[PDB]
């Protein structure tokens, strides 16, 4: 009737071991599933390259600092140029997949801090601008902020999630904390959420992956200053339809 602190996540040829894990958040209680015949609309037979694309891709490592605001990734965009997933995402017009997001941040028992690892469906990034005409560039975020790639994007205003919504209510989304005294990893299994059965992996980013320090990383002199935060994600039940020439963006 409890959650075991040890966990092993084996997907494909990738395996993730954690010895200080809180639990595994199954987003909205729904495992990732393949598109049923009732919900499908595209007639082409989808490709399900099970083990070549459904596997853990360690994508980015961000150095947690005392004044760090946080980072966000867009799930399809963060894997669109990586591995056989990226190739299928480029060669195919349609794509659907869940994911198993695994954020890793280990620190000594003398460090402190708390990250909020949340998976935000349809994470539309806002721009912070003064009162200006709709002609103004500052009213709308550039592409580097909407699709940060694999490197992610440092939050400008994590208090409002760079979306005008309060960070305090970001816990309405499938979330997990990395409290350094408690756990060093946060696992979120997110099913494919979209008003469409399939969608373009290049145009549309289904989920945002926010890692925001709520309690700032504090430690004493002599502790290891560099405390990294690693994002390992794994597609789950990846389908691809609409084969054509490979399209980058």
């Amino acid at each position: 009737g409890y959650s075991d602190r040890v966990a092993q996540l084996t997907v494909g040829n990738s395996t993730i071991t954690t010895q200080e894990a809180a639990n595994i958040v199954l987003s909205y209680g729904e495992w990732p599933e393949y598109c049923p015949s009732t919900d499908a609309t595209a007639v082409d037979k989808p490709t399900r390259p099970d083990v070549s694309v459904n596997r853990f891709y360690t994508l980015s490592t961000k150095s947690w600092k005392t004044e760090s605001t946080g980072w966000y990734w867009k799930f399809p965009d963060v894997l669109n140029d990586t591995g056989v997933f990226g190739q299928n995402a480029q060669f195919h017009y349609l794509y659907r997949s869940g994911f198993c997001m695994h954020v890793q941040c280990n620190a000594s028992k003398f460090h402190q801090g708390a990250l909020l690892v949340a998976a935000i469906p349809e994470f539309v990034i806002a721009a912070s601008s003064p009162a200006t005409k709709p002609n103004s560039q500052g009213l709308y975020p550039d592409f580097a902020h909407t699709n940060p790639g694999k490197d992610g994007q440092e939050f400008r205003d994590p208090y409002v999630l760079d979306a005008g919504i309060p960070l305090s209510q970001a816990l309405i989304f499938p979330h997990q904390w990395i409290n350094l005294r408690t756990n060093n990893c946060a696992t979120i299994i997110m099913p494919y959420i979209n008003a469409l059965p399939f969608d373009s992996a290049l145009n549309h980013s289904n989920f945002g992956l926010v890692v925001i320090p709520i309690s700032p990383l504090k430690y004493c002199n002599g502790a290891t200053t560099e405390v990294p935060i690693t994002l390992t994600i794994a597609p789950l039940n990846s389908e691809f339809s609409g084969l054509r020439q490979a399209i980058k963006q």
């Binding site: 402190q112 309060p166 960070l167 305090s168 408690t182 959420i193 309690s215 504090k218």
Partner: protein, 240 residues
């Protein structure tokens, strides 16, 4: 012609009238309904999700720092860490909560609340806190001796990093008005004060000031009534 007599309320447009109206599109079959994960059918289900209380809503405190209750090693005993009123719809820490924002779309609320405090210090940081809920009629307790006379929990920091303080539904009326202030302090819910039961003890070479994150939500018996319009965002011109 069938004899009929028009009654008052004829020709009126009541914005909350669940009635029929002619369909603009004869024979329109919409796009099929596919399964989308995360369907919510009740706003009470949203109010039970714990969201961060903005307890450090003080002048100077900006950004995510407003979500932290600072806890440090005390030089004296029986001291006050933080306090906040537990009126969900009152301008204050509960504004940052999903329950405190959905409450504002309703006039009257009822049921127990729940604040889960998460300690975000070092593993080596130990401490015991007395988190007391003071039912109405009393101001904020001036001493821990006065606060421990109300609904309280003595929280011990440890492997489990979170404690839940249920604010029990202690009310004279079945519902409390979401509006507060003035004569509407009749519907005051109370005050939650966090006291140092013991000190915040740390070994050497360990941070001496940590943070408690408060997570407010609604209990299973929570209920809202009389949907109204919130007073959270105002508009002076149509968004173009």
């Amino acid at each position: 012609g069938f004899p009929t007599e028009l009654k008052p309320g004829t020709n009126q447009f009541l914005t909350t009238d669940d009635g029929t109206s002619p369909p603009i599109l004869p024979g329109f079959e919409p796009t099929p309904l596919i399964h989308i994960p995360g369907e919510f059918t009740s706003l009470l289900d949203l109010c039970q999700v714990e969201t961060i209380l903005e307890v450090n809503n003080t002048t100077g405190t900006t950004g995510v720092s407003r979500l932290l209750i600072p806890v440090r090693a005390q030089n004296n005993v029986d001291q006050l860490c933080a306090s906040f009123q537990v009126d969900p719809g009152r301008n204050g820490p509960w504004q940052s909560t999903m329950v405190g924002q959905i409450c504002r779309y309703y006039t009257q609320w009822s049921g127990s609340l729940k604040v889960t405090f998460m300690f975000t210090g070092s593993f080596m940081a130990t401490g015991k806190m007395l988190i007391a809920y003071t039912p109405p009629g009393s101001a904020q307790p001036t001493t821990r001796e006065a606060a421990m006379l109300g609904t309280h929990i003595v929280w011990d920091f440890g492997l489990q990093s979170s404690v839940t303080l249920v604010i029990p539904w202690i009310s004279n009326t079945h519902f409390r008005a979401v509006k507060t202030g003035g004569v509407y302090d009749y519907y005051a819910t109370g005050i939650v004060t966090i006291w140092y039961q013991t000190n915040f003890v740390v070994p050497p070479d360990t941070p001496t000031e940590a943070n408690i994150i408060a997570l407010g939500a609604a209990q299973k018996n929570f209920t809202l009534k009389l949907c109204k319009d919130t007073d959270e965002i105002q508009q002076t011109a149509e968004y173009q």
